[PDB]
């Protein structure tokens, strides 16, 4: 019936796939999903072997939409070479700054995600699947629980789904405020009822995950592609966008654009096109100064002609586009990124624990003009020394974006030293 208030994020698509329904800012329940041919891909999937499904997902060129772009079919293959039981996890922790692509699938077209989960679970022989949704998405949580009951009603979940002999339950767990619980191993620890502390990898979850068993973790958006791959076939899916980085991709665009929101576009779209062709250009038609790819990278105005794909020279990441214009202070922006990492390090690793803290502590001093000479040289050193001994990607990147601003905007930083 009634869900918590959600802002009506603008959404636009040139492909009409992931956002076919989710372009409209409301919950689409199972009847509307079914009228659009929903769950027919699941029926088709259940008449295929798991191996064919893995083969199709592999040949689709689908890559992880959670940010790292690992080939999805290949991840599945690694899982299924290990003895079961196996588990499937949908990562809905989406907490990266600027990143709001996953919630609009969850909150508007939950059956797209659920269908994807059922197909993926069948493909890897998992009879128990989880959605881990961040605690700050309460509406998403209630919407998913309700959608799962709808799917049960209609016989898409439970035992012996559609006479296939395949059994599945999907459990919805909630986070409780930790960005680090989106890291796949910390997510598993949390599902096990513990603190969200990343594990040393390898092993990867596919070898040793939930309860030590083969576990696939996939991002919401990744999973939402799976119904299309089955429905269209892998070849037709590969026609979408460039054949090496095929398929729809969601781009959350925020900051100083005229039309902030989520754009469903192919990955041969350029960053300049995302900003100027789709997102309406800049507020006040000011010049673009920088784009933050979440809290991961900083691209300058000289780097706008790159493709939004997972190539070496491409944008990569989550597809998150935070636009800063000419009057935005880059050091102020850097401080916010430092504050983010300070707040989210889990503190297992010493350089990450003290580095994330000191980077933020000293950058605050610099920003307020209270920094000594040593504070300056200290900030530089700490920024370069968060990564050593780190066992997860947070420590690996906590200094990355800030370093890129030091390199690409030296003049602004110098104003703060002199």
């Amino acid at each position: 019936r009634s869900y918590p208030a959600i802002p009506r994020i603008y959404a636009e698509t040139t492909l009409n796939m992931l956002l076919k329904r989710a372009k409209k800012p409301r919950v689409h329940s199972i009847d509307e999903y079914l009228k659009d041919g929903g769950y027919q891909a699941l029926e088709k999937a259940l008449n295929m072997s798991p191996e064919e499904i893995i083969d199709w997902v592999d040949k689709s060129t689908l890559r992880g939409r959670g940010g790292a772009g690992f080939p999805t079919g290949k991840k599945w293959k690694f899982a299924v070479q290990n003895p079961g039981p196996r588990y499937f996890i949908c990562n809905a922790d989406e907490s990266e700054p600027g990143t709001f692509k996953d919630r609009i699938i969850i909150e508007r077209d939950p059956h797209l995600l659920i269908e994807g989960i059922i197909i993926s679970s069948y493909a890897i022989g998992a009879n128990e699947a989880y959605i881990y949704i961040r605690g700050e998405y309460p509406a998403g949580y209630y919407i998913l629980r309700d959608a799962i009951e709808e799917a049960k009603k209609k016989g898409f979940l439970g035992k012996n789904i559609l006479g296939s002999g395949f059994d599945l339950e999907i459990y919805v767990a909630r986070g409780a405020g930790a960005y680090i619980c989106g890291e796949e191993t910390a997510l598993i620890e949390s599902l096990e009822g513990k603190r969200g502390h990343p594990r040393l990898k390898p092993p990867y979850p596919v070898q040793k995950g939930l309860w030590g068993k083969p576990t696939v973790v996939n991002n919401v958006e990744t999973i939402a592609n799976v119904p299309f791959i089955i429905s269209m076939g892998w070849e037709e899916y590969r026609y979408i966008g460039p054949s090496d980085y095929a398929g729809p991709k969601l781009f959350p665009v925020s900051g100083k654009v005229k039309k902030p929101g989520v754009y469903e576009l192919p990955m041969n779209t350029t960053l300049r096109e995302v900003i100027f062709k789709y997102a309406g250009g800049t507020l006040g038609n000011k010049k673009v100064k920088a784009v933050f790819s979440g809290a991961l990278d900083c691209f300058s105005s000289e780097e706008l002609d790159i493709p939004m794909d997972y190539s070496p020279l491409g944008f990569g990441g989550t597809g998150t586009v935070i636009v800063l214009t000419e009057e935005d202070d880059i050091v102020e922006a850097a401080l916010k990124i430092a504050e983010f990492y300070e707040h989210e390090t889990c503190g297992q690793c010493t350089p990450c624990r003290v580095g994330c803290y000191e980077q933020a502590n000293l950058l605050e001093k610099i920003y307020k003009g209270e920094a000594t000479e040593q504070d300056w040289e200290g900030f530089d050193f700490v920024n370069r020394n968060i990564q050593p001994t780190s066992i997860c990607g947070l420590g690996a990147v906590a200094g990355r974006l800030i370093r890129q601003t030091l390199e690409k905007f030296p003049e602004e930083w110098e104003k703060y030293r002199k």
Binding site: P4, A5, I6, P7, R8, I9, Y10, E94, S95, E96, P97, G98, T99, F100, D102, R103, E128, R134, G135, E136, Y137, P138, A139, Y171, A173, R174, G175, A176, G177, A178, Y179, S190, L191, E192, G193, K194, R195, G196, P252, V253, S254, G255, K256, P260, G261, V262, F292, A295, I322, L324, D328, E332, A333, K336, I337, E339, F340, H343, E344
Partner: protein, 156 residues
Amino acid sequence: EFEFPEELKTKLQEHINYFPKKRQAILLCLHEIQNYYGYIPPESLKPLADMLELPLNHVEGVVAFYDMFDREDKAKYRIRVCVSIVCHLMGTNKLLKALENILGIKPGEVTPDGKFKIVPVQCLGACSEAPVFMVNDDEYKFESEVQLNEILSRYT
């Protein structure tokens, strides 16, 4: 000894029975406890540990780890204000100012009646609608002080 009112205990037991293993329910239980009390009562943790069949120090450590849980301050409504990069750029400080004008409190503080607590949080994943705040489970774009004032009037 402290004991959970039956209506809460019932809900806790639903969570505990939901997952294949009891201990997986810990965060759902803690959310439920904070919903009920407006915070996590220290005394609540021992009975919860029993129900989860976990040691108390395990439960204590989990409450400490997860930032949504609050053992300090009782508040009927938590106003979560995003202080991350996009909301910062687009006017977090105007939201905080508006909140101080209406309620008389700054981040980390609670109104004298125990009604509202301002809680600074990282990115809430609604950045296109910056600057973003939540009131308990409800989430909104801040437009202006008159707009904020109308929204807050709905929480009684």
